[PDB]
Design a protein around this motif. Structure first.
Motif, short mmCIF file in Angstrom:
data_model
loop_
_atom_site.label_atom_id
_atom_site.label_comp_id
_atom_site.label_asym_id
_atom_site.label_seq_id
_atom_site.Cartn_x
_atom_site.Cartn_y
_atom_site.Cartn_z
N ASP A 7 0.86 -1.21 0.00
CA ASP A 7 0.00 0.00 0.00
C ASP A 7 0.89 1.25 0.00
O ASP A 7 0.64 2.14 -0.77
CB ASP A 7 -0.98 -0.07 1.17
CG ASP A 7 -2.03 -1.15 1.02
OD1 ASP A 7 -2.38 -1.50 -0.13
OD2 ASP A 7 -2.51 -1.64 2.06
N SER A 8 1.87 1.30 0.90
CA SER A 8 2.76 2.47 1.09
C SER A 8 4.22 2.02 1.00
O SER A 8 4.83 1.76 2.04
CB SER A 8 2.48 3.18 2.36
OG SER A 8 1.15 3.66 2.39
N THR A 9 4.74 1.89 -0.22
CA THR A 9 6.16 1.54 -0.44
C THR A 9 6.81 2.50 -1.43
O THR A 9 8.02 2.73 -1.29
CB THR A 9 6.28 0.08 -0.87
OG1 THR A 9 5.46 -0.14 -2.02
CG2 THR A 9 5.87 -0.87 0.24
N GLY A 10 6.06 3.01 -2.41
CA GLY A 10 6.61 3.79 -3.54
C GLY A 10 7.54 2.95 -4.40
O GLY A 10 8.32 3.53 -5.17
N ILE A 11 7.45 1.62 -4.33
CA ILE A 11 8.31 0.70 -5.13
C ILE A 11 7.40 -0.06 -6.08
O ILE A 11 6.45 -0.68 -5.61
CB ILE A 11 9.13 -0.22 -4.21
CG1 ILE A 11 10.06 0.60 -3.31
CG2 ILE A 11 9.88 -1.26 -5.04
CD1 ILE A 11 10.69 -0.21 -2.19
N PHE A 12 7.70 -0.03 -7.37
CA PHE A 12 6.90 -0.70 -8.42
C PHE A 12 7.75 -1.78 -9.09
O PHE A 12 8.92 -1.56 -9.38
CB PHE A 12 6.41 0.31 -9.45
CG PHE A 12 5.57 1.41 -8.85
CD1 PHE A 12 6.17 2.49 -8.20
CD2 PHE A 12 4.17 1.38 -8.93
CE1 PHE A 12 5.40 3.48 -7.62
CE2 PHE A 12 3.42 2.38 -8.31
CZ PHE A 12 4.03 3.43 -7.68
N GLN A 13 7.13 -2.93 -9.36
CA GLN A 13 7.81 -4.08 -9.98
C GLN A 13 7.01 -4.58 -11.17
O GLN A 13 5.77 -4.53 -11.14
CB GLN A 13 8.02 -5.17 -8.93
CG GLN A 13 9.16 -4.84 -7.98
CD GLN A 13 9.61 -6.00 -7.13
OE1 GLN A 13 8.90 -6.99 -6.97
NE2 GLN A 13 10.81 -5.87 -6.58
N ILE A 14 7.71 -5.11 -12.16
CA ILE A 14 7.11 -5.71 -13.37
C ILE A 14 7.99 -6.89 -13.78
O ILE A 14 9.22 -6.84 -13.58
CB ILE A 14 6.95 -4.63 -14.46
CG1 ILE A 14 6.03 -5.09 -15.59
CG2 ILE A 14 8.27 -4.23 -15.05
CD1 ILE A 14 4.66 -5.51 -15.15
N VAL A 15 7.40 -7.92 -14.36
CA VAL A 15 8.16 -9.12 -14.81
C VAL A 15 8.17 -9.13 -16.33
O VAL A 15 7.11 -9.15 -16.93
CB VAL A 15 7.60 -10.41 -14.21
CG1 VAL A 15 8.27 -11.63 -14.81
CG2 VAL A 15 7.73 -10.41 -12.70
N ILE A 16 9.35 -9.11 -16.92
CA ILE A 16 9.53 -8.99 -18.39
C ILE A 16 10.26 -10.23 -18.87
O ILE A 16 11.25 -10.64 -18.24
CB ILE A 16 10.27 -7.69 -18.74
CG1 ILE A 16 9.53 -6.47 -18.20
CG2 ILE A 16 10.52 -7.60 -20.24
CD1 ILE A 16 8.10 -6.36 -18.67
N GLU A 17 9.79 -10.78 -19.98
CA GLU A 17 10.48 -11.89 -20.68
C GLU A 17 11.38 -11.28 -21.75
O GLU A 17 10.88 -10.46 -22.56
CB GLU A 17 9.46 -12.85 -21.26
CG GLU A 17 10.04 -14.14 -21.79
CD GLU A 17 9.08 -14.97 -22.62
OE1 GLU A 17 9.52 -15.95 -23.24
OE2 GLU A 17 7.88 -14.63 -22.66
N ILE A 18 12.63 -11.72 -21.78
CA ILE A 18 13.61 -11.24 -22.78
C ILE A 18 13.16 -11.75 -24.15
O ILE A 18 13.00 -12.95 -24.35
CB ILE A 18 15.03 -11.69 -22.44
CG1 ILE A 18 15.45 -11.19 -21.05
CG2 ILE A 18 15.98 -11.25 -23.55
CD1 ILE A 18 15.40 -9.69 -20.86
N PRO A 19 12.86 -10.84 -25.10
CA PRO A 19 12.38 -11.25 -26.41
C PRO A 19 13.39 -12.05 -27.24
O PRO A 19 14.56 -12.07 -26.96
CB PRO A 19 12.07 -9.94 -27.15
CG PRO A 19 11.94 -8.92 -26.06
CD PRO A 19 12.75 -9.39 -24.88
N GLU A 20 12.85 -12.71 -28.26
CA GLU A 20 13.63 -13.42 -29.30
C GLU A 20 13.90 -12.43 -30.43
O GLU A 20 15.05 -12.24 -30.82
CB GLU A 20 12.80 -14.59 -29.82
CG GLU A 20 12.53 -15.68 -28.79
CD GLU A 20 13.79 -16.37 -28.30
OE1 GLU A 20 14.72 -16.47 -29.10
OE2 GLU A 20 13.85 -16.77 -27.11
N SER A 21 12.83 -11.79 -30.90
CA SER A 21 12.84 -10.89 -32.07
C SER A 21 11.83 -9.78 -31.83
O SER A 21 10.61 -10.07 -31.76
CB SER A 21 12.53 -11.67 -33.31
OG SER A 21 12.38 -10.79 -34.43
N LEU A 22 12.31 -8.55 -31.70
CA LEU A 22 11.46 -7.37 -31.42
C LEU A 22 10.67 -6.98 -32.67
O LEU A 22 9.43 -6.96 -32.62
CB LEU A 22 12.35 -6.20 -30.98
CG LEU A 22 12.89 -6.30 -29.56
CD1 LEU A 22 13.80 -5.12 -29.26
CD2 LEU A 22 11.74 -6.37 -28.57
#
Lengths: 62, 145
Positions: A7-22
């Motif tokens: 609720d009160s951290t100011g920290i945001f996280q996201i999980v990304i997969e490293i692409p093969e071909s953009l």
């Protein structure tokens, strides 16, 4: 997209997969990748708008 | 075949929103691609030979053409247990989706074996511990001898 880690951290996280071909172009080994975020409203700015500061991160394919 | 939530566990009623598609609750994929039956208007590709992927599967005796055709359902174990279970059987062949950005999907012209491809299930929680929308999943490998 980004989400807070509580609720009160100011920290945001996201999980990304490293692409093969953009864009139908495949990534190479050891390729230089730069992550850029434009913080509209740095310490420098007086209001949100105004000045900008760029924060960078570099990552590698193995 | 006229909705973006085809061959997935959810609702035919749907909308396009930021987090994804609002009518989608669970789906099953081979090699990170939706496991769907070759039906609709965009299933006319024949591939190498002159046989379309739909009749190509039928000649192999396969009736499990996609998740919708196995009769897969999520059933709660008890009246108020809160645990849902479904099951189905892995097929020998499947038809890959070429383009997911069109409705109906566009299917390839040739069937492919399921052996050596990973299988995944994806669940979308409309309400996590915080009341926000997140997706969770599990994976496994299909093998052959």
């Amino acid at each position: 997209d980004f989400r807070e880690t509580g609720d009160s951290t100011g920290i945001f996280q996201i999980v990304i997969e490293i692409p093969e071909s953009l864009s139908n172009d495949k990534l190479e080994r050891g390729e230089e990748i730069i992550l850029e975020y434009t913080d509209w409203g740095p310490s420098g700015s007086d209001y949100v708008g105004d000045e900008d500061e760029d924060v960078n991160l570099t990552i590698y394919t193995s | 075949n006229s909705k973006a939530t085809d061959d997935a566990v959810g609702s035919a009623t749907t909308q396009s929103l930021s987090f994804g598609e609002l009518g989608r609750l669970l789906d099953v994929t081979f090699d990170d691609v939706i496991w769907s039956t070759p039906d609709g208007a965009n299933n006319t590709a024949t591939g190498n030979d002159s046989d379309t992927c739909s009749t190509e599967l039928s000649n192999a005796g396969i009736t499990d053409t996609g998740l919708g055709a196995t009769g897969f359902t999520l059933v709660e174990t008890g009246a108020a247990t809160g645990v849902f279970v479904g099951d189905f059987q892995i097929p020998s062949f499947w038809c890959r989706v070429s383009d997911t950005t069109t409705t109906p999907y566009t299917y390839a012209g040739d069937e492919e074996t399921t052996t050596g491809l990973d299988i995944e299930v994806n669940y979308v929680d409309f309400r996590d511990a915080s009341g926000e929308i997140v997706e969770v999943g599990d994976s496994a490998g299909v093998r052959a001898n």
